[PDB]
Ligand SMILES: Nc1ncnc2c1ncn2[C@@H]1O[C@H](COP(=O)(O)OP(=O)(O)O)[C@@H](O)[C@H]1O
Ligand SMILES: N#CCC(=O)Nc1ccc(Cl)cc1
């Protein structure tokens with residue numbers, strides 16, 4: 001299915017550096033078209049996100065579409081295998097869907113025949129002007145194996161690091177995930193942030209989902225009882241139980257590799 005996504009910049013905790021750089025990447029061509037003439041800038045054709053898994057790459061690709069009132073078409077790495085006109089049939093359906101975001105997910109896998117399902121993507125890329133109104137976003141957890149041809153000028157213009165959330169970003173992920181839940185006043189997410197060092201956004205969302213299931217499973221069983229003879233809330237004790245089921249999903253060793261990779265490019 002092809003639609004305009006529903007997630008907004010507001011559903012994303014942290015990453016505010018990336019957020020304002022993404023906005024001006026798409027807002028500048030349309031808010032000052034009258035200065036993109038004078039000096040002769042050809043607008044951005046694409047970006048590439050890299051970093052640990054479950055830290056917001058897919059959400060910023062949807063949020064970019066929601067901001068541009070664009071359709072979103074999401075194709076996932078291994079399903080490109082049967083088979084080269086696949087790379088031409090998804091591109092035509094995105095051209096058909098303009099204005100559109102084409103999202104290439106999980107193809108660190110492709111980076112190890114498969115040889116030129118890459119080159120068919122690079123040739124499809126170079127043969128699609130900015131005038132078609134398609135914006136390509138790619139994502140990977142293996143930044144050590146990008147073939148640097150996809151980042152040559154004319155293709156995926158920028159490479160952006162989407163890292164594990166620091167203490168201040170965990171408070172914002174928790175707040176953004178519960179923005180529309182009735183959470184009890186005794187709940188302190190600042191304290192929940194200090195206790196979740198190394199947790200990804202995915203991990204933080206899970207903890208939010210378990211406390212939610214408990215607070216309403218408790219709701220059904222109680223007035224099922226108090227009918228034998230007013231909104232309920234998620235409380236501090238629902239979050240306590242929900243944390244026995246809680247530990248990180250990204251290892252310390254792989255956290256060092258990402259930190260080494262991002263840091264060497266300043
Ligand atoms: N920065 C964030 N703010 C709020 N929720 C997040 C954040 N990062 C991850 N999540 C949660 O984890 C889920 C998976 O994230 P996703 O963006 O698909 O990760 P990636 O694409 O980096 O593998 C999201 O749907 C969301 O529930
Ligand atoms: N060792 C090894 C490879 C591995 O399994 N994962 C991995 C590879 C690169 C980065 Cl930058 C992060 C994690």
Ligand code: NA
Nearest residue numbers: 052053054141
């Ligand atoms: Na991932």
